[PDB]
Amino acid sequence: TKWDYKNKENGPHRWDKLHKDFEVCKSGKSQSPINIEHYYHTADLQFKYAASKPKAVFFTHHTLKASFEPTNHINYRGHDYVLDNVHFHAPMEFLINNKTRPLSAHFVHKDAKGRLLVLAIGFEEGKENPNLDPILEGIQNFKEVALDAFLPKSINYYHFNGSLTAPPCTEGVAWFVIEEPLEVSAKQLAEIKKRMKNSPNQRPVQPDYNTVIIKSSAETR
Amino acid sequence: TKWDYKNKENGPHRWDKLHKDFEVCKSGKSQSPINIEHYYHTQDKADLQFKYAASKPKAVFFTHHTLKASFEPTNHINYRGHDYVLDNVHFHAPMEFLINNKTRPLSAHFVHKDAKGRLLVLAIGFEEGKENPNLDPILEGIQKKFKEVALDAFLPKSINYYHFNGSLTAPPCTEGVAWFVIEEPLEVSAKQLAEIKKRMKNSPNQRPVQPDYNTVIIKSSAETR
Numbered sequence A: 001t002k003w004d005y006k007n008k009e010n011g012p013h014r015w016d017k018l019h020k021d022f023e024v025c026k027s028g029k030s031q032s033p034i035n036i037e038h039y040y041h042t043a044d045l046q047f048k049y050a051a052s053k054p055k056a057v058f059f060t061h062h063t064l065k066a067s068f069e070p071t072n073h074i075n076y077r078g079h080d081y082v083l084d085n086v087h088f089h090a091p092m093e094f095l096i097n098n099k100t101r102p103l104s105a106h107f108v109h110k111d112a113k114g115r116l117l118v119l120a121i122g123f124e125e126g127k128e129n130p131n132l133d134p135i136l137e138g139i140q141n142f143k144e145v146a147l148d149a150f151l152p153k154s155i156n157y158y159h160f161n162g163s164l165t166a167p168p169c170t171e172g173v174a175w176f177v178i179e180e181p182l183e184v185s186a187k188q189l190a191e192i193k194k195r196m197k198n199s200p201n202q203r204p205v206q207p208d209y210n211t212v213i214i215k216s217s218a219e220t221r
Numbered sequence B: 001t002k003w004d005y006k007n008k009e010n011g012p013h014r015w016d017k018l019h020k021d022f023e024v025c026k027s028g029k030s031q032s033p034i035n036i037e038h039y040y041h042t043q044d045k046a047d048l049q050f051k052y053a054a055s056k057p058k059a060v061f062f063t064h065h066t067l068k069a070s071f072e073p074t075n076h077i078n079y080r081g082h083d084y085v086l087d088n089v090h091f092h093a094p095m096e097f098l099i100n101n102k103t104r105p106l107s108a109h110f111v112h113k114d115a116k117g118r119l120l121v122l123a124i125g126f127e128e129g130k131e132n133p134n135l136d137p138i139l140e141g142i143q144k145k146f147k148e149v150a151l152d153a154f155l156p157k158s159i160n161y162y163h164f165n166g167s168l169t170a171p172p173c174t175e176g177v178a179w180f181v182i183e184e185p186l187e188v189s190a191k192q193l194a195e196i197k198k199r200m201k202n203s204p205n206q207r208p209v210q211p212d213y214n215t216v217i218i219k220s221s222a223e224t225r
């Protein structure tokens, strides 16, 4: 109950100091997030999403989280990665070619061997997107969340190996950062940021050791 | 208390236990070597230009289960406007990385460091066959206390290689290593093969394949000279 985003002691630059489990926050060579600037052009990525009702929806450790039953899958290279939860970071943590959007959502998965697959996608200030509403009315039954409709059908993405953007900053993370921004309204932006206590929950860009990145594309649905 | 590839306490399964400097040997998520089966095909935007010449080793000696030739900082690799000087060339038998589950009887690692200590290792396998003329200058320098190494002739002109980030394959298992594994195997004679294993004291110095956390690998090819 110690680490936060405050620019003083419990801030990110000192996370390794708060606890030894966070030592990799400093010592690891694949820490996330980063600015995606150098990559290689070149699917094998299957979504198994459905509109799903959350096991629970809650704000925890400074983000808004919807936890889920092991019913929604992503298959990657012939291995099934179960979605655990989707949570939000504001502003966006990852950067693409020096570009920033004010919000992202992370879709967290784990396979048979316990390996992590996380998805980062942006929101763009503009028209109100309906997908947000089933979770924002879930403080208490829980209404179904439209997962198979959340992401674009056609996606361009960046894939690389990184770490968690939050303590313990565990590595072995397969990142897929989606290029296409989703849309978010200005009223929704401020409203949900208030559940982010209008206090940023975004880890700074980590040092980049020539991460190998592929740019590819896929169809989600 | 020193690390080995032997069956008991100082083996690879236990390197982490030998020294705390070696903790990442087990706990790291980007540990080498691995079995290369999944990769991405790509184009040649690859900024990898060799700056190699024939060079006489500062020394050729046995250290840590391998045969090593260290060099004057005269031989280089350039990668995206980032130049890596060759530190040494050393050997593994059998080859430590696997290319589609295929095993080579031997490999060579071209170990580089930039100014700030960033690591680039270059790996190529060897296949039993014709007398390799480049090898014996090394086999002719180890009992002395050194002849030019035809580095300018050592690697193939046209290479297919795999690129990714991994670790050193021996303790301290340092991560953040830019690996370039070249697909085309070089050629070695049966006695060149036999003899050097004895200079590597006939005790295999091959770290087992490590857990792979979906390492992102690209396949491309290039011209060295």
Ligand SMILES: CC(=O)/N=c1\sc(S(N)(=O)=O)nn1C
Binding pocket: A084, A085, A106, A108, A118, A163, A164, A165, A166, A167, A168
């Ligand atoms: C359960 C879960 O998803 N935990 C997470 S996710 C995460 S992140 N924001 O994807 O890098 N950091 N932590 C602690």
Ligand SMILES: CC(=O)/N=c1\sc(S(N)(=O)=O)nn1C
Binding pocket: B087, B088, B109, B111, B121, B167, B168, B169, B170, B171, B172
């Ligand atoms: C000086 C030097 O090259 N040391 C090395 S190289 C190496 S390797 N087998 O290339 O990953 N492991 N260690 C300890």
Ligand SMILES: [Cl-]
Binding pocket: A033, A092, A093, A094, A095, A104, A120, A121
């Ligand atoms: Cl992000």
Ligand SMILES: [Cl-]
Binding pocket: B033, B092, B095, B096, B097, B107, B108, B123, B124
């Ligand atoms: Cl190897």
Ligand SMILES: [Zn+2]
Binding pocket: A087, A088, A089, A105, A106, A165
């Ligand atoms: Zn997240």
Ligand SMILES: [Zn+2]
Binding pocket: B090, B091, B092, B109, B169
């Ligand atoms: Zn080696």
